[PDB]
Amino acid sequence: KVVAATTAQIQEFTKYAGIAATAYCRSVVPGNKWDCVQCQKWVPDGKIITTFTSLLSDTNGYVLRSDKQKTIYLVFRGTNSFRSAITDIVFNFSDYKPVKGAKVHAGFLSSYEQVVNDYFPVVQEQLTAHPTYKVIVTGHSLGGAQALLAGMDLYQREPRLSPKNLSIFTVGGPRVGNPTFAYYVESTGIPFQRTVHKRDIVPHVPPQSFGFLHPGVESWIKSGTSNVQICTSEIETKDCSNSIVPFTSILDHLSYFDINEGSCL
């Protein structure tokens, strides 16, 4: 139930932290260029299909297609001022209208409704252009809450996406919903991989005392770069990053497998 990660999996989890890091380069969004170091390192033939920015909540993201890897990537990020994203949050809920009994964080859902009409027809269009390709959704920090709600809404509202071609990856993701929402997520069968690095605070906020719970399987970077234990349950265990609480840190939020997550370095 608590395995070490095969280097093959450490490679996979690193590829996606590197793509989530690209969303912080201005030149990618709103710059509309794929010429950043991480960019070119993980998906060299990427064609940026779109970028969208929400000036209201500073939720940015982009749709990217890679004919080589047969993947359509949906990537998000919120604000990169992370000490004010954490101190200025409200741990209140909104109803998750698709599922009876579910509720998600109120602010992350209002940032999501703000940008859904900017990616969703573009993704749909690329699956009609490219029907054999898979959709990977990804992000760091607040961008991880958007990614989980994004992959769940693509599941709900697009017939062609299912566990065969929809995948979700986040590094640094906050919790998003109450236990019924968590339950529904693992019930979809969409693979969700939540990596958290060492003592990073943000997967620990909003806390369980307020009613929030994480779905998906946790892969914890314990020491440095290849020491990743996997808590293979699809609901969160106290066996992985929850064991270090309250000895928590915002500084571990800022690099994942040694890639800067926050400043495009």
Swiss-Prot record:
Biological role stated in the UniProt entry: Hydrolyzes ester bonds of triglycerides as well as of their derived partial glycerides with a strong 1,3-positional specificity.
GO biological process, one term: lipid catabolic process
Catalytic activity, reaction form: a triacylglycerol + H2O = a diacylglycerol + a fatty acid + H(+)
Cysteine pairings via disulfide bonds: 25-264, 36-39, 231-240
Active site: 141 (nucleophile), 200 (charge relay system), 253 (charge relay system)
Full-sequence portion shown in this chain: 128 to 392 of 392
Temperature dependence: Optimum temperature is 35 degrees Celsius.
Annotated protein name in UniProt: Lipase
GO cellular component: extracellular region
Enzyme class of the recorded protein, top EC level: hydrolase
Record localization: Secreted, Extracellular space
pH relationship of activity: Optimum pH is 6.0-6.5.
List of residues binding Ca(2+): 252
Sorted UniProt keywords: Calcium, Cleavage on pair of basic residues, Disulfide bond, Hydrolase, Lipid degradation, Lipid metabolism, Metal-binding, Secreted, Signal
Family label: Belongs to the AB hydrolase superfamily. Lipase family.
The species this protein was found in: Rhizopus niveus
Molecular function terms, GO-annotated: metal ion binding; triacylglycerol lipase activity
EC number, as in UniProt: 3.1.1.3
Regulation: Lipase activity is maximal at a lipid-water interface (interfacial activation), probably by an induced conformational change that results in an increased accessibility of the active site to the substrate.
